[PDB]
C-alpha cells in the first residue's frame, strides 16, 4: 500500500509569544497531576521547559494529551486538526473538558464527606447530653 510521511508541522518564523501558551499547558497539566494524581511526577521532573531540550514541542503536546481521559473518537478528532494552534486548541479544550468532570468529582466527594461529618457531629453533642443527664441524677 502506498504511503507518505505526512508529518505536517508548519510554524511561523517568529517563535516568541507562541511558547506563552505552552506555559499554560504545562501549568494546567501540573494541576491535573496535582489535583487528579494519575501518574508519578518524576517523569515531569525529567523534562523541564527551562532546559530547552524539548526539540519536539509537538511531541510534548501529544504527551500532555496522553494524560487526557477523552474518548478514542475525540483523540481521532484531535488528529483531524491540521493547523498547529487549532490542534493545541483542541487538546486544551479536551484538558478543560477533563478538568470539569474531575473537579466535579472532587467537589462531590468533599461535599458528601462533610455531609457525613454534619450527620455524626450533632449526634456527638446529643451523646454528651444523654450522658450528662445519666450521671447528674
Amino acid at each position: 500500500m502506498v504511503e507518505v510521511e505526512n508529518v505536517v508541522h508548519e510554524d511561523f518564523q517568529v517563535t516568541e509569544e507562541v511558547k506563552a501558551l505552552t506555559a499554560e499547558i504545562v501549568k494546567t497539566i501540573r494541576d491535573i497531576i496535582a489535583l487528579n494524581p494519575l501518574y508519578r511526577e518524576s517523569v515531569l521532573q525529567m523534562m523541564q521547559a527551562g532546559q530547552r531540550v524539548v526539540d519536539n514541542p509537538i511531541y510534548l503536546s501529544d504527551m500532555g494529551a496522553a494524560l487526557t481521559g477523552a474518548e478514542s473518537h475525540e483523540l481521532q478528532d484531535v488528529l483531524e486538526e491540521t493547523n498547529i494552534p487549532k490542534r493545541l486548541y483542541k487538546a486544551l479544550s479536551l484538558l478543560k473538558k477533563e478538568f470539569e468532570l474531575s473537579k466535579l468529582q472532587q467537589r462531590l466527594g468533599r461535599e458528601v464527606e462533610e455531609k457525613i461529618k454534619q450527620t455524626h457531629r450533632k449526634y456527638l453533642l446529643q451523646e454528651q447530653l444523654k450522658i450528662i443527664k445519666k450521671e447528674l441524677g
Binding site: 504511503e3 511531541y59 501529544d62 504527551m63 494529551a65 496522553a66 483523540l75
Partner: protein
Amino acid sequence: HLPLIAITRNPVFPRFIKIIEVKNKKLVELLRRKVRLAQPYVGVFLKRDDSNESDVVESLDEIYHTGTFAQIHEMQDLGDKLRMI
C-alpha cells in the same frame, strides 16, 4: 502489505509506550513471521465507531487510514502468549 493488527481495545497514544494483549494466537504467528527480517517493524492504528471483531477481519475499512509505524522492542509473554510492546 501485512494483515491489519487486531488492536482489540488497546489505545496507543503518540509518544507514550504501551502494551498490547490480544487473546487470539494468530498474531503470534505473524510476529514470528517478522522476526527473520533484519529491520522488523510494526504499525499502530485506532478503531472506528461500533467495534466488531467479526468486521475487523472481514472488511479493512473499520480501521482508520491513519497509522503510526514504529519498530518493535522486545517480547515478554510472562503469563499470556502475546504481550507485545
